[PDB]
């Protein structure tokens, strides 16, 4: 199993293409084996990059020699990983003895799938677990469908999490959401009213082989586990794979790359499964992608500075979704289009969704901003979930009121 003893996350200030390109170059060709955690944007944002202990010295020396300034934001990755393991280990002991599912914890894919089966069993008239496809390693892809329509197809909102496996707060936020809907139906007047007019489809783990791989082999793994047929390298970036300016900017055609788009659009059977479900249904109004980290809330476009026709509307909804999310804890989110807020990125879920006639396409990037990154402590799940929920309810109330 992957160990990260002495590994450090370094945060680097970057001002122009001189600094951006040399840093981009240095480990897009894998001298030093650096895994970028927060991707190079432009002038603005800070870059986060995981630096293996073996390679601490060369990289820091090189940063000095290239006039790049850095802080060490995580001094020992493995320490954080240890904490997480124990917290998980412990919770599973309690749950096995409890028969409970503790939502304030991180879970195996089996516990997620099971709890989804339990949410449907408990509320048979509202929720059912629908199998939409198969993962590359041939696991079910399980969604929860929420509906008061009694079989009939209604206008619909898609909510998926965990397309990038290491972004554990998304999956955990998603399974908390499923339980939130069923417990707050016939009680909270807004979700009750949402479900009267629309269906909600929830996919907690959009990338299940990667999620299992992160819990058993490599916690920092982000891609699918597809076997790239002219290479020994594994997996594609699920979120670079969609049929939306595929193989454009922000993607690589190198199978070994973390941003590898795949051999063709929707090649990743996990993506195809969702692309197929949605287009078969034909009546999706909302599509919300849940990621981590950076505390962002974004809308199309991402592959171009093209600028979406409904940018104005999407901006206002996102602004109010963020404002309402903040209400809970004081959590501050940036809002804006993808290509500017992060960096030009092709073939993303939300761009495909918008280009396919789903107006309200939104990327959430959840907690945090870099203190723990992907390794967000378990004790922050319920706060992230509870606050994000108000962000989600807002979007879905705009969808309800603006049916087209
Ligand atoms: C990509 O989307 C376009 C527009 O709907 C479609 O014509 C094309 O067949 C798609 N490409 C693939 C290979 O799925
Ligand atoms: Zn992600």
């Amino acid at each position: 199993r992957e160990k990260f003893f002495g590994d450090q996350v370094l945060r680097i200030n970057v001002r122009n293409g001189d600094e951006i390109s040399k840093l981009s170059q240095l480990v897009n060709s894998n001298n030093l084996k650096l895994n970028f955690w927060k991707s190079p944007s432009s002038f603005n944002r800070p870059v986060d990059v995981l630096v293996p202990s073996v390679s601490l010295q060369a990289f820091k020396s090189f940063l000095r020699s290239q006039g790049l300034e850095y802080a060490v934001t995580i001094e020992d990755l493995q320490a954080l990983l240890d904490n997480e393991d124990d917290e998980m280990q412990h919770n599973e002991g309690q749950e096995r003895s409890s028969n409970n599912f503790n939502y304030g914890a991180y879970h195996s894919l089996e516990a997620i799938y099971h709890e989804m089966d339990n949410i449907a069993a408990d509320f048979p008239d509202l929720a059912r677990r629908v199998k939409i496809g198969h993962s590359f390693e041939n696991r079910p892809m399980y969604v929860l469908k929420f509906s008061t329509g009694k079989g009939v197809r209604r206008p619909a909102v898609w909510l998926n999490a965990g397309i990038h496996s290491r972004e554990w707060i998304s999956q955990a936020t998603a399974i908390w959401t499923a339980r939130k809907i069923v417990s707050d139906y016939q009680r909270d007047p807004a979700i009750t009213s949402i479900l009267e007019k629309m269906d909600i489809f929830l996919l907690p783990v959009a990338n299940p082989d990667g999620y299992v791989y992160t819990q058993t082999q490599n916690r920092l793994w982000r891609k699918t586990r597809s076997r790239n047929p002219g290479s020994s390298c594994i997996g594609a970036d699920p979120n670079r794979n969609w049929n939306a300016s595929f193989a454009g900017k922000g993607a690589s055609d190198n199978p070994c790359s973390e941003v590898y788009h795949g051999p063709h659009a929707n090649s990743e059977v996990e993506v195809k499964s969702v692309v197929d479900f949605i287009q078969k249904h034909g009546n999706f109004k909302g599509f919300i992608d849940l990621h981590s980290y950076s505390q962002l809330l974004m809308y199309p476009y991402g592959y171009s500075v093209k600028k979406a026709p409904d940018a104005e509307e999407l901006d206002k909804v996102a602004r109010l979704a963020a404002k309402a999310l903040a209400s809970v804890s004081g959590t501050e989110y940036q809002v804006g289009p993808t290509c500017t807020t992060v960096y030009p990125a092709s073939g993303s879920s939300i761009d495909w969704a918008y280009d396919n006639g789903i107006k309200f396409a939104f990327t959430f990037e959840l907690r945090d901003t870099g203190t723990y990154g992907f390794l967000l402590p378990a004790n922050q799940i319920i706060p992230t979930a509870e606050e994000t929920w108000l962000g989600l309810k807002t979007i879905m109330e705009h969808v309800r009121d603006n049916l087209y």
Side-chain angles (χ1 to χ4, degrees), residues 106-117:
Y106 286 120
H107 301 84
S108 66
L109 187 65
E110 189 186 303
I112 300 168
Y113 281 179
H114 191 66
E115 186 56 14
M116 275 166 90
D117 196 283

PDB file of all heavy atoms in Angstrom, residues 106-117:
ATOM      1  N   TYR A 106     -16.252   8.379   7.282  1.00  0.00           N
ATOM      2  CA  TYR A 106     -15.950   7.994   5.914  1.00  0.00           C
ATOM      3  C   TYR A 106     -16.211   6.488   5.786  1.00  0.00           C
ATOM      4  O   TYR A 106     -16.014   5.754   6.752  1.00  0.00           O
ATOM      5  CB  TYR A 106     -14.495   8.350   5.594  1.00  0.00           C
ATOM      6  CG  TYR A 106     -14.246   9.843   5.397  1.00  0.00           C
ATOM      7  CD1 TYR A 106     -13.340  10.541   6.228  1.00  0.00           C
ATOM      8  CD2 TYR A 106     -14.894  10.563   4.371  1.00  0.00           C
ATOM      9  CE1 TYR A 106     -13.096  11.913   6.053  1.00  0.00           C
ATOM     10  CE2 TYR A 106     -14.644  11.924   4.166  1.00  0.00           C
ATOM     11  CZ  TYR A 106     -13.755  12.607   5.027  1.00  0.00           C
ATOM     12  OH  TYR A 106     -13.519  13.963   4.865  1.00  0.00           O
ATOM     13  N   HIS A 107     -16.695   6.032   4.629  1.00  0.00           N
ATOM     14  CA  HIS A 107     -17.054   4.610   4.478  1.00  0.00           C
ATOM     15  C   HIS A 107     -16.474   3.946   3.236  1.00  0.00           C
ATOM     16  O   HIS A 107     -16.154   4.617   2.244  1.00  0.00           O
ATOM     17  CB  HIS A 107     -18.570   4.375   4.503  1.00  0.00           C
ATOM     18  CG  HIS A 107     -19.255   4.836   5.756  1.00  0.00           C
ATOM     19  ND1 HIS A 107     -19.654   6.139   5.947  1.00  0.00           N
ATOM     20  CD2 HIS A 107     -19.635   4.161   6.871  1.00  0.00           C
ATOM     21  CE1 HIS A 107     -20.252   6.254   7.123  1.00  0.00           C
ATOM     22  NE2 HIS A 107     -20.273   5.063   7.695  1.00  0.00           N
ATOM     23  N   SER A 108     -16.287   2.626   3.350  1.00  0.00           N
ATOM     24  CA  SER A 108     -16.120   1.727   2.223  1.00  0.00           C
ATOM     25  C   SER A 108     -17.319   1.859   1.279  1.00  0.00           C
ATOM     26  O   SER A 108     -18.463   2.183   1.699  1.00  0.00           O
ATOM     27  CB  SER A 108     -15.992   0.271   2.721  1.00  0.00           C
ATOM     28  OG  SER A 108     -17.206  -0.182   3.333  1.00  0.00           O
ATOM     29  N   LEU A 109     -17.038   1.565   0.016  1.00  0.00           N
ATOM     30  CA  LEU A 109     -18.033   1.439  -1.035  1.00  0.00           C
ATOM     31  C   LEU A 109     -19.203   0.482  -0.692  1.00  0.00           C
ATOM     32  O   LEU A 109     -20.341   0.763  -1.085  1.00  0.00           O
ATOM     33  CB  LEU A 109     -17.368   0.996  -2.344  1.00  0.00           C
ATOM     34  CG  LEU A 109     -18.368   1.015  -3.506  1.00  0.00           C
ATOM     35  CD1 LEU A 109     -18.830   2.450  -3.788  1.00  0.00           C
ATOM     36  CD2 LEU A 109     -17.869   0.335  -4.762  1.00  0.00           C
ATOM     37  N   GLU A 110     -18.914  -0.621   0.022  1.00  0.00           N
ATOM     38  CA  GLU A 110     -19.929  -1.579   0.480  1.00  0.00           C
ATOM     39  C   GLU A 110     -20.883  -0.981   1.497  1.00  0.00           C
ATOM     40  O   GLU A 110     -22.080  -1.333   1.522  1.00  0.00           O
ATOM     41  CB  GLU A 110     -19.237  -2.806   1.116  1.00  0.00           C
ATOM     42  CG  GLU A 110     -20.150  -3.974   1.451  1.00  0.00           C
ATOM     43  CD  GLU A 110     -19.444  -5.110   2.220  1.00  0.00           C
ATOM     44  OE1 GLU A 110     -18.430  -5.636   1.683  1.00  0.00           O
ATOM     45  OE2 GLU A 110     -19.930  -5.505   3.363  1.00  0.00           O
ATOM     46  N   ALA A 111     -20.362  -0.135   2.388  1.00  0.00           N
ATOM     47  CA  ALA A 111     -21.227   0.513   3.394  1.00  0.00           C
ATOM     48  C   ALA A 111     -22.080   1.609   2.731  1.00  0.00           C
ATOM     49  O   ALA A 111     -23.261   1.751   3.051  1.00  0.00           O
ATOM     50  CB  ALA A 111     -20.408   1.072   4.589  1.00  0.00           C
ATOM     51  N   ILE A 112     -21.492   2.344   1.788  1.00  0.00           N
ATOM     52  CA  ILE A 112     -22.241   3.350   1.016  1.00  0.00           C
ATOM     53  C   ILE A 112     -23.393   2.674   0.226  1.00  0.00           C
ATOM     54  O   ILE A 112     -24.588   2.990   0.425  1.00  0.00           O
ATOM     55  CB  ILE A 112     -21.303   4.174   0.071  1.00  0.00           C
ATOM     56  CG1 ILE A 112     -20.201   4.928   0.849  1.00  0.00           C
ATOM     57  CG2 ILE A 112     -22.157   5.112  -0.776  1.00  0.00           C
ATOM     58  CD1 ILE A 112     -19.088   5.513  -0.014  1.00  0.00           C
ATOM     59  N   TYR A 113     -23.054   1.683  -0.586  1.00  0.00           N
ATOM     60  CA  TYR A 113     -24.051   0.953  -1.367  1.00  0.00           C
ATOM     61  C   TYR A 113     -25.147   0.377  -0.470  1.00  0.00           C
ATOM     62  O   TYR A 113     -26.320   0.417  -0.845  1.00  0.00           O
ATOM     63  CB  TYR A 113     -23.396  -0.164  -2.136  1.00  0.00           C
ATOM     64  CG  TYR A 113     -22.699   0.289  -3.405  1.00  0.00           C
ATOM     65  CD1 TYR A 113     -22.031  -0.636  -4.203  1.00  0.00           C
ATOM     66  CD2 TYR A 113     -22.695   1.641  -3.819  1.00  0.00           C
ATOM     67  CE1 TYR A 113     -21.369  -0.244  -5.397  1.00  0.00           C
ATOM     68  CE2 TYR A 113     -22.014   2.034  -5.047  1.00  0.00           C
ATOM     69  CZ  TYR A 113     -21.385   1.090  -5.806  1.00  0.00           C
ATOM     70  OH  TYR A 113     -20.716   1.442  -6.989  1.00  0.00           O
ATOM     71  N   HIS A 114     -24.753  -0.145   0.698  1.00  0.00           N
ATOM     72  CA  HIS A 114     -25.686  -0.747   1.651  1.00  0.00           C
ATOM     73  C   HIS A 114     -26.628   0.255   2.264  1.00  0.00           C
ATOM     74  O   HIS A 114     -27.814  -0.031   2.450  1.00  0.00           O
ATOM     75  CB  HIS A 114     -24.951  -1.476   2.772  1.00  0.00           C
ATOM     76  CG  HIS A 114     -25.845  -2.311   3.618  1.00  0.00           C
ATOM     77  ND1 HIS A 114     -26.504  -3.418   3.130  1.00  0.00           N
ATOM     78  CD2 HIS A 114     -26.234  -2.179   4.906  1.00  0.00           C
ATOM     79  CE1 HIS A 114     -27.233  -3.953   4.086  1.00  0.00           C
ATOM     80  NE2 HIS A 114     -27.085  -3.219   5.174  1.00  0.00           N
ATOM     81  N   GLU A 115     -26.092   1.416   2.614  1.00  0.00           N
ATOM     82  CA  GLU A 115     -26.869   2.459   3.257  1.00  0.00           C
ATOM     83  C   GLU A 115     -27.849   3.051   2.262  1.00  0.00           C
ATOM     84  O   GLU A 115     -28.958   3.449   2.618  1.00  0.00           O
ATOM     85  CB  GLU A 115     -25.954   3.524   3.894  1.00  0.00           C
ATOM     86  CG  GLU A 115     -26.658   4.593   4.735  1.00  0.00           C
ATOM     87  CD  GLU A 115     -27.513   4.033   5.854  1.00  0.00           C
ATOM     88  OE1 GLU A 115     -27.387   2.836   6.168  1.00  0.00           O
ATOM     89  OE2 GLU A 115     -28.320   4.790   6.451  1.00  0.00           O
ATOM     90  N   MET A 116     -27.452   3.053   1.004  1.00  0.00           N
ATOM     91  CA  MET A 116     -28.337   3.442  -0.098  1.00  0.00           C
ATOM     92  C   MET A 116     -29.471   2.461  -0.254  1.00  0.00           C
ATOM     93  O   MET A 116     -30.583   2.855  -0.556  1.00  0.00           O
ATOM     94  CB  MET A 116     -27.561   3.466  -1.401  1.00  0.00           C
ATOM     95  CG  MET A 116     -26.840   4.723  -1.656  1.00  0.00           C
ATOM     96  SD  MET A 116     -25.675   4.410  -3.001  1.00  0.00           S
ATOM     97  CE  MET A 116     -26.762   4.848  -4.447  1.00  0.00           C
ATOM     98  N   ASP A 117     -29.160   1.174  -0.111  1.00  0.00           N
ATOM     99  CA  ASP A 117     -30.183   0.140  -0.150  1.00  0.00           C
ATOM    100  C   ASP A 117     -31.102   0.303   1.063  1.00  0.00           C
ATOM    101  O   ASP A 117     -32.316   0.090   0.950  1.00  0.00           O
ATOM    102  CB  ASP A 117     -29.546  -1.258  -0.192  1.00  0.00           C
ATOM    103  CG  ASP A 117     -30.528  -2.344  -0.628  1.00  0.00           C
ATOM    104  OD1 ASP A 117     -31.402  -2.792   0.198  1.00  0.00           O
ATOM    105  OD2 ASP A 117     -30.503  -2.839  -1.782  1.00  0.00           O
TER     106      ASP A 117
END
